[PDB]
Amino acid sequence: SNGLEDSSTISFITWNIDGLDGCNLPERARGVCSCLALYSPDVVFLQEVIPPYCAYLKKRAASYTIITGNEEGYFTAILLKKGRVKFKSQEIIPFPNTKMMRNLLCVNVSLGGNEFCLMTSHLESTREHSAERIRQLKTVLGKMQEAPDSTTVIFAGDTNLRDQEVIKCGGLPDNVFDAWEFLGKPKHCQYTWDTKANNNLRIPAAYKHRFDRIFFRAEEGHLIPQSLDLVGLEKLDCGRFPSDHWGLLCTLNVVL
Amino acid sequence: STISFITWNIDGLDGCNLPERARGVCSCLALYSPDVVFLQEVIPPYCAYLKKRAASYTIITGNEEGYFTAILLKKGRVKFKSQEIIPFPNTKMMRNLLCVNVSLGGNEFCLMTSHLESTREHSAERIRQLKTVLGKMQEAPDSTTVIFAGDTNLRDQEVIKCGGLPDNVFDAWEFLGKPKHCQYTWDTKANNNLRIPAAYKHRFDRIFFRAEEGHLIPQSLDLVGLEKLDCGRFPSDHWGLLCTLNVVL
Ligand SMILES: [Mg+2]
Numbered sequence: 001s002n003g004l005e006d007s008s009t010i011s012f013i014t015w016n017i018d019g020l021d022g023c024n025l026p027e028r029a030r031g032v033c034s035c036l037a038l039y040s041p042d043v044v045f046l047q048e049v050i051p052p053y054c055a056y057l058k059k060r061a062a063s064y065t066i067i068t069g070n071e072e073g074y075f076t077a078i079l080l081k082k083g084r085v086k087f088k089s090q091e092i093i094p095f096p097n098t099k100m101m102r103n104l105l106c107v108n109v110s111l112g113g114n115e116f117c118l119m120t121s122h123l124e125s126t127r128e129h130s131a132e133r134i135r136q137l138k139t140v141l142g143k144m145q146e147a148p149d150s151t152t153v154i155f156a157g158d159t160n161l162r163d164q165e166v167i168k169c170g171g172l173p174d175n176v177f178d179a180w181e182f183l184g185k186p187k188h189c190q191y192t193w194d195t196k197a198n199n200n201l202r203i204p205a206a207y208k209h210r211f212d213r214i215f216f217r218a219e220e221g222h223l224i225p226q227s228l229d230l231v232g233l234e235k236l237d238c239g240r241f242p243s244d245h246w247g248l249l250c251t252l253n254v255v256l
Numbered sequence: 257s258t259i260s261f262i263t264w265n266i267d268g269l270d271g272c273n274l275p276e277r278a279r280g281v282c283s284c285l286a287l288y289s290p291d292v293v294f295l296q297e298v299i300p301p302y303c304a305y306l307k308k309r310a311a312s313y314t315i316i317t318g319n320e321e322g323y324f325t326a327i328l329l330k331k332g333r334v335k336f337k338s339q340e341i342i343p344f345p346n347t348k349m350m351r352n353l354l355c356v357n358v359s360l361g362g363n364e365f366c367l368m369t370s371h372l373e374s375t376r377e378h379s380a381e382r383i384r385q386l387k388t389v390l391g392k393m394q395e396a397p398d399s400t401t402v403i404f405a406g407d408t409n410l411r412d413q414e415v416i417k418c419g420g421l422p423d424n425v426f427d428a429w430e431f432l433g434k435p436k437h438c439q440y441t442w443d444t445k446a447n448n449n450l451r452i453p454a455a456y457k458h459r460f461d462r463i464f465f466r467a468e469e470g471h472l473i474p475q476s477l478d479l480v481g482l483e484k485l486d487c488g489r490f491p492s493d494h495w496g497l498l499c500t501l502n503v504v505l
């Protein structure tokens with residue numbers, strides 16, 4: 001449980017849970033929920049949620065308030081641990097040129113005696129949509145910069161980024177950091193989508209990417225990543241994983 | 257005091273109406289009787305045809321199998337001195353750089369052609385090949401006039417990525433003031449050979465030259481091959497370029 005000693009921390013998971021794959025979806029949702037029960041994160045950032053998946057989450061993850069990025073199709077969601085996180089508002093920023101109904105979902109909350117703006121997105125998919133993905137990244141980073149200086153901004157989501165693309169933007173702006181980079185680029189959680197290790201898409205080839213990423217903007221030294229680890233690497237009863245992506249579990253300390 | 261030439265990707269890879277289209281190319285060449293013809297996408301039976309139909313030209317080829325370039329040199333006007341083939345080590349499309357050393361009277365030339373790597377997706381390799389071409393153009397003695405004519409598949413931004421043409425290498429179309437009437441050499445609005453139901457146009461076919469100041473002066477540039485044949489298609493999906501130049505001492 002979250003005691004006094006652990007009160008300066010925020011923990012979260014971000015995970016594209018592949019709700020577009022209808023096969024074995026209820027069992028796979030139960031697998032995601034088992035992971036949430038194991039770690040009891042304060043916040044969960046999800047991508048590729050669909051409406052019946054919301055019902056699975058209400059059943060097996062009932063301690064979370066669910067905020068969604070849309071009502072129909074597939075969309076992102078932010079889950080907030082009841083009793084820990086106080087919800088203040090939700091904002092949705094459009095991506096006017098998306099061809100995949102993507103957008104930027106933000107929720108303003110209070111947690112641990114601190115004000116946060118929590119953001120997620122599922123940026124335009126595939127190599128061929130690089131230009132639009134880069135435009136969306138700019139929208140995300142601009143929104144991170146625009147937040148009031150007092151609030152702690154955390155983005156976590158499925159960026160679909162290739163390393164060359166971040167550079168095409170000129171890189172993360174000066175007060176914005178990537179949690180994996182901050183922690184010294186640890187190899188154990190570098191790749192979040194890996195067709196050698198994960199067979200869910202049935203791709204007969206071996207490719208791996210760091211698609212899922214965490215960005216944060218805080219006043220100097222005020223937000224310090226403590227750990228980053230993969231989740232969802234256990235096969236379920238059906239012999240498949242919860243998703244084609246691995247999830248990321250992150251803890252950060254909010255410091256005076 | 258002149259040299260005249262045509263450069264033309266004649267699409268030997270399109271087997272449909274190929275015999276009629278090859279005869280169409282040559283009917284076209286017969287109208288202009290150029291000193292030199294640079295061809296791309298020649299295939300072996302097309303080459304066999306040219307060896308008979310164009311027996312009045314010396315025919316130099318870039319390969320013997322698949323598809324390849326050729327340079328045709330008018331006998332009695334052009335003295336053939338040597339050929340050189342330079343590989344593009346990373347081509348995935350058997351492309352290369354074909355060069356011939358020739359003389360027209362007292363004037364020595366190095367004439368070059370290539371069919372640079374095709375498609376937007378192969379931009380990086382195409383740029384590497386362009387660099388190989390430009391490097392080679394610099395190698396000739398200063399008194400030798402160097403002309404490259406071929407299907408470059410270039411986008412203008414790719415030439416910028418390359419660093420631009422060097423100060424001593426000129427594009428004949430640019431030299432002539434960027435005339436609009438012969439700008440685009442591949443145009444799916446005007447050319448139906450690929451049955452592309454949309455309008456796209458590119459200046460893929462280009463002419464570069466290096467000559468001592470004022471010793472090679474482009475005079476004209478025109479598109480050729482714009483007449484539909486009996487079968488209702490064109491000799492190629494590309495138009496050819498006919499260029500006339502003076503060599504002025
Ligand atoms: Mg997916």
Ligand SMILES: [Mg+2]
Pocket residue numbers: 265267297
């Ligand atoms: Mg072609």
